[PDB]
Amino acid sequence: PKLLNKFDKTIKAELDAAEKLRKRGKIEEAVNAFKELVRKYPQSPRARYGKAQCEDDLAEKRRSNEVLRGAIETYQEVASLPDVPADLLKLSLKRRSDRQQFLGHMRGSLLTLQRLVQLFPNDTSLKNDLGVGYLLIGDNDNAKKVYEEVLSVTPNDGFAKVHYGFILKAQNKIAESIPYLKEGIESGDPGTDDGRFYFHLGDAMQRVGNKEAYKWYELGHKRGHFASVWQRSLYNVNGLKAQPWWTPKETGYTELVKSLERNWKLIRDEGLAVMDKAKGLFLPEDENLREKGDWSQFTLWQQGRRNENACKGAPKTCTLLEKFPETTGCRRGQIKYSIMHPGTHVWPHTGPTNCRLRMHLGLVIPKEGCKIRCANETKTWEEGKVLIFDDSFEHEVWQDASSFRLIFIVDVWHPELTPQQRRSLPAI
């Protein structure tokens, strides 16, 4: 890294002294030393960058968003000075973008990243990072255009290949996504050894019929991304008991299970009334998990938050459930009705986290044609009975009956989670 311009070379002694304090952990001392350097040398880019790095370190020490916001501004000040070395320019704005993302100012990060690309149009890596910016805000279209530019200039870029294949796969171009994902992971370029790309490569292969999907699940297990070939959630807490099927007694949630089974007809009747008189409240499944068929969901709780308008449609069910914070407070799960019609097949898939168990309460179950596989075991629902499985394991669903199948889904915290984790885990 070349960081000192002509003027900063003449004051390297004062700059190096200030930086030594930062490397020694005297954070409060180094900020005041760099502050005094900025006052004395208001045009020095190294001194201004030192002040931002110190404000950055201090923000970590105190876990302060306000301090980090000030560092984010000082990083930009560096770019407004005259005669800033290009290496210092990249570093100051790249770090600003990163910290803007860490704060959730995704729109601000994107503006910073766009400036970097305008300043250095030949840096492939900055374009790759701009593509990530677009993906973080969900703009897959602009992300796709970015990575196409990269693959035109550097067509062997592994980072660009996996992210291109991820976008294709997300746009349901399943067959087309596979070579981009396989060639990125195999390139070994930095950023390609990520569970997300193993997850979707094997899922894309499973959908098209290629039997080599297992090998990629195994490789992801060998490289520490998946807890097993079968349990492929990516937002995990280590050590939690891992088994596909659970009994009520094993979960310890026996009061909740008994309440569900004793009052099941009430839950059924409020769901049927919504189907009949408020059908619009059932929304189609929107995660591209279906091969074919009709599957819709009517959600009462999501991420630990009650849906007020939805509970107006099932008020007795919502009253009943409010007694059980183990599900209403589960910020990594949902409470919802789920209806599936004949001719529906749900692709093998896993949920995103191992921090929940998923209960199914049967409400209207045709006597033939409905079944659910989890790991190597297939089971069926019973009206008025609870089934419990860990949906972080691979599972698959078929609906080949002659009428609709309605169940009630109740997610609970994994029982071995401590209360501390239950309140601190980021919602999903």
């Binding site: 923000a59 876990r63 302060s64 968003n65 980090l68 993302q101 860490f102 704060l103 959730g104 995704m106 993906l135 973080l136 969900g138 991820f166 997300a170 997300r196 997850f199 959630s233 990516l234 937002y235 499944e285 995660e287 591209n288 998990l289 999501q302 991420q303 949902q334 898939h349 896993t350 949920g351 995103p352 949906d391 980021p426 919602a427 999903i428």
Partner: peptide, 17 residues
């Protein structure tokens, strides 16, 4: 959001410290 599956690039939100 990632409800039944894992389809998003990231499933969580960033809110600082």
């Amino acid at each position: 959001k990632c409800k039944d599956g894992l389809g998003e690039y990231t499933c969580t939100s960033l809110e600082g410290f």
